[PDB]
Design a protein around this ligand. Sequence first.
Ligand SMILES: O=[N+]([O-])c1ccc(S(=O)(=O)N(Cc2ccccc2)[C@H]2CNC[C@@H]2N(Cc2ccccc2)S(=O)(=O)c2cccc([N+](=O)[O-])c2)cc1
Lengths: 116, 116
Amino acid sequence: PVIPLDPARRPVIKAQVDTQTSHPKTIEALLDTGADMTVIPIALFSSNTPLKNTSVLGAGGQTQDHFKLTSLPVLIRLPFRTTPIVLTSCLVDTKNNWAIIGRDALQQCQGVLYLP
Amino acid sequence: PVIPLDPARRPVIKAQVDTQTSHPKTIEALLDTGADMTVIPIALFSSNTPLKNTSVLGAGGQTQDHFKLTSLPVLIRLPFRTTPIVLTSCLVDTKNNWAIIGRDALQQCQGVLYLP
Ligand SMILES: O=[N+]([O-])c1ccc(S(=O)(=O)N(Cc2ccccc2)[C@H]2CNC[C@@H]2N(Cc2ccccc2)S(=O)(=O)c2cccc([N+](=O)[O-])c2)cc1
């Protein structure tokens, strides 16, 4: 589908996220061309899985306690599409409720940005 | 043009920005569909130049200090189209000097996100 760009209406999508730590979950995620890596809420991971340490830069400066890093690949499926997007590693938001589809996933699904 | 999406290569673009407080300048801006409002470097604005205090959400939570708000509209020109993008107001990065094209500007040039 063609998704219009609107400052008042964020470009969201419903995507099934398989973290391979629990059961695959359909969540609402922001489509983000500014993001390099995909951000997945920590609420989808099991309580006993190890996550790597890292630091990420953003608006309110950088941080090292806000984001973590997956130990296992994350599979992401789109609404009617059936083959999953395979991300070797992706960011994990441990504080807020953040689901962000980055360019890493937007590449495998042939996603592009068009300017008339 | 059709801008491809790649995690290893940011969707940057050259744009001419007029802050109406000084000489119009050329910057390299990041095409960001996740940004509600456009962010321009404070290095564009003259030294005086009243700017408003504002609060912005991003990476390391919310920030009371990083971003300011323009008092006057911001003229933005792109390589292709001859007519300029007119934003009523946009964000100003004081800490760093990021150039980020949000959906506010992408709407006025009718930019869309295409997912096959
Ligand atoms: O207009 N806004 O509300 C608005 C909000 C937020 C921003 S923003 O944080 O600077 N800034 C821009 C930006 C771009 C590149 C690098 C850092 C920041 C945001 C906007 N999109 C990228 C970035 N981040 C996500 C996000 C999206 C919407 C709202 C808040 C935060 S981020 O940082 O979590 C995610 C962030 C950064 C990097 C990665 N990653 O995978 O590498 C993922 C700008 C404008």
